[PDB]
Subunit: 237 residues, 4 copies
Amino acid sequence: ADTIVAVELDTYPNTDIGDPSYPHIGIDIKSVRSKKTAKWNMQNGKVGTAHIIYNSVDKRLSAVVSYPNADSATVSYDVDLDNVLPEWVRVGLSASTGLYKETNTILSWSFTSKLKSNSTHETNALHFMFNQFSKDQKDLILQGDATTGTDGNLELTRVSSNGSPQGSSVGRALFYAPVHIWESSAVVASFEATFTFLIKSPDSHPADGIAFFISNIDSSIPSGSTGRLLGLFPDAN
Amino acid sequence: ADTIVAVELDTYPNTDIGDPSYPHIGIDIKSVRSKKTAKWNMQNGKVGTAHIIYNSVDKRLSAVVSYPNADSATVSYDVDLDNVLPEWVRVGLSASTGLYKETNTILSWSFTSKLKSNSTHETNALHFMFNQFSKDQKDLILQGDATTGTDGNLELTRVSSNGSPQGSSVGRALFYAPVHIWESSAVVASFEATFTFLIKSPDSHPADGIAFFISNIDSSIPSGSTGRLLGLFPDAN
Amino acid sequence: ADTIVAVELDTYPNTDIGDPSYPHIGIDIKSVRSKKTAKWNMQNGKVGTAHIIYNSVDKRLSAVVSYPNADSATVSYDVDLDNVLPEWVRVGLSASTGLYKETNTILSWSFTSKLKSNSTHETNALHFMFNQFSKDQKDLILQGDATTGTDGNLELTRVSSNGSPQGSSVGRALFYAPVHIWESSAVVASFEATFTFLIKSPDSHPADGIAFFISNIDSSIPSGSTGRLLGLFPDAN
Amino acid sequence: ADTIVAVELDTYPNTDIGDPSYPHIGIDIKSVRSKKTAKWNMQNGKVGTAHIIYNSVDKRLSAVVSYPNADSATVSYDVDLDNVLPEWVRVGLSASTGLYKETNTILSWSFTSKLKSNSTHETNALHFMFNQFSKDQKDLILQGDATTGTDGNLELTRVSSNGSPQGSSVGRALFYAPVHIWESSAVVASFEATFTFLIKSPDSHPADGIAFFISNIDSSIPSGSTGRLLGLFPDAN
Ligand SMILES: O=C(NCCOCCO[C@H]1O[C@H](CO)[C@@H](O)[C@H](O)[C@@H]1O)c1ccc2cc(C(=O)NCCOCCO[C@H]3O[C@H](CO)[C@@H](O)[C@H](O)[C@@H]3O)ccc2c1
Ligand SMILES: O=C(NCCOCCO[C@H]1O[C@H](CO)[C@@H](O)[C@H](O)[C@@H]1O)c1ccc2cc(C(=O)NCCOCCO[C@H]3O[C@H](CO)[C@@H](O)[C@H](O)[C@@H]3O)ccc2c1
Ligand SMILES: [Ca+2]
Ligand SMILES: [Ca+2]
Ligand SMILES: [Ca+2]
Ligand SMILES: [Ca+2]
Ligand SMILES: [Mn+2]
Ligand SMILES: [Mn+2]
Ligand SMILES: [Mn+2]
Ligand SMILES: [Mn+2]
């Protein structure tokens, strides 16, 4: 079972597995059962922005989801990630549908990672920025139902040629090169991630949501992770 | 009286205005009596590094000070800076000697500040980086005994023509352009500061220390703020 | 008499002082009579982008100006900027109007400058990024008829409350920190400027243009620099 | 047959395959026989810096190799890289030795790559920065005899425990993630590469040198490409 850390943009209350009774944003440390949640005020058919930050000094993982001309939703969590995560990781975006469904459109994705070591005090860094996605994007690893190059976007779950999101779909996109997310001889370690998304649904209810996640480098869609497990966890422990 | 927010490197305990028994780092909100400190084994003659960070999600001002191959010293304080600092500020570095003295050399200084708007979801940013200082650096404002150009460094307090530190000396360097440090309608504000330093003294007691600070744009050194007031404060309140 | 280097977006042919017969972009070294130009098919009412670049290796000033889904205009001139500009300078944007007029609206501006020094092989950098301009922009120096804050933009030339641009107007925005644009002992030096704009006009010929420029720190609008002079040159030599 | 673009730092003059009679830098478009060279006063045992730049507005590839307090050496070549390179590429460092030998040490490596597209005017970017290389650098592909970890440096070719260099050696380090180096529909595209090296010989003759290169993503060391072929080319046509 793969080590997962994720910030989930959960659009579907799964009350049987501990979801609060409203669309919410969550911090998931090795479980779909969030460690901290926050009411999120989703706008169907509106482009939204997500922003995740962590730094090894506060050892706190914050995320803020926001639409133009509306309030934030924030959710933070004290967590020492070098006790959770392997030293090297891949980071990625994940998304799923179930009985109910939604477009899981990714529009822009950026990410920054820094290690400021304790031996030499000289920093290592990684930075990537996707504002559009071509049809044959080679620094991305696509898993399951994800496809790029439709209107310059990254489409995480399926969309028909008639634009209608499909059900029982899971897709992920991972950045191709692994990231050095912590190291014992490091004074300060920090990362930032940002993406913009468009969730649109013809149903009265949209599901299930998008997640930003960090994981061991060889992670893949777990068996049966469609629907409420967001392509992230095999089960619901 | 200016509005100072500062992170002090205090190499001399003034136990009588409230410093602890050992040389320390601390966070100063509008008063030289640190709202929070931590002990800091200053290595005399030796190049150290200060990293300061703050972000509007956490509203936590944090700082790490470290030497190569030595445990670091860290200190953090939760403070809503937008109720303390004017909306625009200037950032700078400051130092002072009293009876006991030390060289207060700055070898490199860098700073990043960012504001993402909630109306437009677009970013304003400022970044500057000094890895060597020149004789007539026009983006710095030097106050008091601060000079630049000596071996390409920034000497905060005064040195002699025979490399000797001097007492009763005080000096400051401000980044010339003003800085937009919080905006009522921003979703996330964050800033980051880094400098390196060599403090050297022939004495057995070096004093007083070095501070990164943030102030109102028009700030000047207060009268007789040498010594234990670090060129920041008019008094010990 | 100021020293001006500029990249000009020239909406209005003034053939009697050397402009070509059509709208154009040009490099200007200490003269309004461009050393080099290209045909610019300016699009009334559309947002466009300009990208300017220079580096000490190749000592060549190049600009690209285009609109979405339109071909670009580029223009290039070999110039050793350190036999032209003072070692410290200020960067800015400028626009004028004359008998004919246009909106000279600035939606974004970013600038980046780097000095890798021969003595140490370590780098000084300045970077600033504007994506909205507040009503009180303290890191901008506003000159002439220039204003920030209306809809988050910088309006370089006078715009009435009804939104119509006026004739007989000149306006300049400069960044507040002077910029170390060259050093005799730097292995490599480079700078990069980008801005987005909106020239909308009611007149069947709009006038006069926008310009990015670099000048000595204290530069101010020359006398009678409206119209074809573009707020940069006192006369047309 | 791999496609190769390389800036080479050639320490051993092979006058039989077109090398000049003197240690030199050169620019290699698909051939070990440089398209353009420049005398380079190698400095045995000291740390040097190499800065490479290319942009699509000017289709000129440039490098500067210099030491602390010496004259730079620069070489440049007009070349439209998108007639020579596939759109996606991997970037890397290479070194080799023949009969005569040298330590081919890399102490730092940074690379920046930027793509602004014409359909949207919205930018994609990659940046990575190695100031120290660890025992298991997961974002690096090590080929031949390249190892990381010793002194925090990257050794492209075999060094014994003594520090003694080892003949008939070749090694390459490539960045893990593939890089979008051009795109037919981008307004402006550019990349930057920087690294610091130490070339220490016991012989009076060092050989053969270090190279920054860009190749097809699946590139591997050509057979028998030690010596003058630097790890890049199969034969010396
Ligand atoms: O005791 C103090 N101050 C005492 C106050 O109570 C204790 C607080 O001590 C300090 O201790 C800490 C700093 O060390 C701080 O935490 C405190 O705030 C405080 O400032 C005190 C304060 C300032 C001083 C400044 C100098 C100075 O200008 N530096 C150069 C070295 O000495 C001067 C030589 O120049 C001339 O000097 C004399 C002229 O008169 C002649 O004899 C000499 O031949 C010569 O021509 C020297 C001694 C000082 C002593
Ligand atoms: O049709 C066109 N558009 C171009 C398309 O090409 C058409 C080719 O054919 C033209 O010319 C042909 C032959 O001549 C005719 O047959 C055609 O019918 C047509 O007119 C066209 C475009 C530009 C023109 C510029 C002038 C011109 O003389 N320009 C400068 C004169 O001064 C104006 C006031 O000056 C004041 O205000 C200016 C503007 O605010 C400031 O800069 C000044 O500093 C000052 O404050 C005149 C006619 C133009 C006609
Ligand atoms: Ca759910
Ligand atoms: Ca003190
Ligand atoms: Ca004109
Ligand atoms: Ca050779
Ligand atoms: Mn949930
Ligand atoms: Mn103190
Ligand atoms: Mn012109
Ligand atoms: Mn050669």
